[model samples]
Target: AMQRQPVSSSRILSIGYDPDNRMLEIQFREQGTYQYLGVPERAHQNFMSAVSKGRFFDGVIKGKFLCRKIG
Candidate 1:
């Protein structure tokens, strides 16, 4: 999926979202897959359109929501 495409980042591998559940799933190259909860839809939209997914996450999503490592 385009939403989960690779980016020019070292920490992140890809990312995914679930609007219905307000969840943000991040697949990191070194950290592993994690799912964030209680995220706003707008954040997901902004993240999807962001030029740098890792930066968007570090700036917008990191420490801003609840999350858990799934795999």
Candidate 2:
């Protein structure tokens, strides 16, 4: 699992990586509540690590990973 700071309006954020199942489970507090955003495990891990390592721009620019635009 990985913990992250607030992005946009989210809080108490965490991402769970299940390599064996190849699934990622993301949880965050939104409007004083928790919600889940599930995706492929590898994708979540890579994205989280990339951001944590300050490789956000590199990853996006290089097409190493895709970021979904929810807005």
Candidate 3:
């Protein structure tokens, strides 16, 4: 399992990253957890630095990477 980090966002509860496998894990407030495959470190960093995490997630992360439901 990846290390989970809590974030302040209405739609997102937390974020997790597995650098070894390049997996991005998102824990949503109502949607549960999903692990996205092949996420680059830069993208994750951008997402973390974005003003609005929900927006960045919707605009860039969501549906952009192949995913697996993990929750």
Which candidate number has the best TM-score?
3
Q: What lDDT tens digits, residue by residue, belong to model 1 across residues 12-46? A: 88777777888878888878888899988899889
TM-score of each: 0.81, 0.37, 0.95
CA lDDT for candidate 3: 0.93
- TM-score (C-alpha, index-matched) for candidate 1: 0.81
lDDT of 1: 0.80
Model 3 agreement with the true structure over 43-68: per-residue lDDT tens digits: 99998898999999999998999999
Task: Assess each prediction's global lDDT (C-alpha) against the native.
Answer: 0.80, 0.40, 0.93
- Angstrom error at residue 64, model 3: 0.7
- The regions of model 3 sitting more than 4 angstroms off are none
Clashing pairs in 2: none
Candidate structures ordered by lDDT, highest first: 3, 1, 2
Model 2 ranges off by over 4 Å:
1-12, 31-41, 52-71
TM-score of structure candidate 2: 0.37
Writing each residue's lDDT as its tens digit, candidate 2 over 1-71 gives: 44334333223344444555444333444522222334455555465655342243234322432333222
